Amino acid sequence: TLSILVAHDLQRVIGFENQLPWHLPNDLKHVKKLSTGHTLVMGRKTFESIGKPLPNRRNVVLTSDTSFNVEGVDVIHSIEDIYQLPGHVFIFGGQTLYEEMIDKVDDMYITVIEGKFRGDTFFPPYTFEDWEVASSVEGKLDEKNTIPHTFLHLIRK
Ligand SMILES: NC(=O)c1ccc[n+]([C@@H]2O[C@H](COP(=O)([O-])OP(=O)(O)OC[C@H]3O[C@@H](n4cnc5c(N)ncnc54)[C@H](OP(=O)(O)O)[C@@H]3O)[C@@H](O)[C@H]2O)c1
Ligand SMILES: COc1cc(Cc2cnc(N)nc2N)c2c(c1OC)O[C@@H](C1CC1)C=C2
């Protein structure tokens, strides 16, 4: 199983200066829950953003750099290597990966952040004409989680 994992705002911003533009613990708990015991694929920039392997799952980092050999982390140098990986594979970011994989994944788990932020990286445009809403569940707003947000599970029609 090949899935995208992404959080994006109303204009499909995903990134600003190699960080997330928003602070939203719920989303991060969601990511954790979904991908425990499974595999994350991710481009070098996103990994260096996170700065160390994510515990309790297989971290795979896609890079052109053949000197890459980080403890905790498996490296690949081709998009095609993704299809070799066993198990549930989540495409974890960032923009380059999403663009490369979006026509290939079986489904997407998306957090829509119901705000407009300044970004420098984006999720590719997509149509619900192409993608069916298997579930839509509103994040809960609270002291700690203060932007409206919706958990979409979409599956390719
Ligand atoms: N909202 C979210 O859910 C979310 C999730 C993840 C990331 N982000 C954001 O996304 C932004 C980063 O996106 P980005 O596109 O700039 O970076 P990125 O996708 O994380 O990484 C790009 C790098 O990945 C490697 N790569 C990609 N495709 C490759 C290929 N086909 N073959 C070999 N290597 C390949 C290359 O590394 P090398 O140059 O080393 O070869 C490339 O420079 C950040 O702002 C981050 O905060 C948001
Ligand atoms: C740009 O830096 C980060 C990028 C991601 C990828 C990501 C985040 N949220 C969602 N809904 N999907 C993702 N693929 C995550 C992240 C980042 O920095 C912290 O935190 C992780 C932490 C919660 C485990 C979760 C995903």
From Swiss-Prot:
Catalytic activity: (6S)-5,6,7,8-tetrahydrofolate + NADP(+) = 7,8-dihydrofolate + NADPH + H(+)
Name under which the protein is recorded: Dihydrofolate reductase
Organism: Staphylococcus aureus
Record-listed E.C. numbers: 1.5.1.3
Pathway assignment: Cofactor biosynthesis; tetrahydrofolate biosynthesis; 5,6,7,8-tetrahydrofolate from 7,8-dihydrofolate: step 1/1
First-level EC class: oxidoreductase
Matches recorded under Pfam families: DHFR_1
Ranges where the DHFR domain occurs: 1-156
A GO biological process held by the record: one-carbon metabolic process
Taxonomic lineage of the native organism: Bacteria, Bacillati, Bacillota, Bacilli, Bacillales
Family per record: Belongs to the dihydrofolate reductase family.
